[PDB]
Structure 1
Amino acid sequence: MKDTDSEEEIREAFRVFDKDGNGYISAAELRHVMTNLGEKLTDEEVDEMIREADIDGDGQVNYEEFVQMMTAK
């Protein structure tokens, strides 16, 4: 669509922790977020699914790498 207009609902459901921090949050942050935004699973499916987003590129799980969970293609 345009740059990244799909991270609107994501950054919102994830900014609760990295709102003004850096976008990249810890796994414990995702387990609580991915477990409620449009998604909703368990601290095991999320902590074991973060290996897909957060891995070492830069910050743990930022929005650019967080949308991969709510829509990993």
Structure 2
Amino acid sequence: ADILSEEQIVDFKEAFGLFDKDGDGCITVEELATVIRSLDQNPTEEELQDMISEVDADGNGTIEFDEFLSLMAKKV
């Protein structure tokens, strides 16, 4: 139970808008995937499978704003 960090909201947003031009706003599973590799982190993939598959409400198999925030709320 936590919330993203302000300064961290901008940092990620900047990288999001840079990697997201389609303007579609939302992103797929692959988009974030790669971004995960570039990010100097080491998160368990097993989780993503559980979350993404347990978060994808739209059922389109794609990540979105809320969907992304929810993943962090639990993960973080």
TM-score relative to the length of structure 2: 0.49
User: Higher Cα Rg: structure 1 or 2?
Assistant: 2
Higher share in helix = 2
Higher share in strand = 2
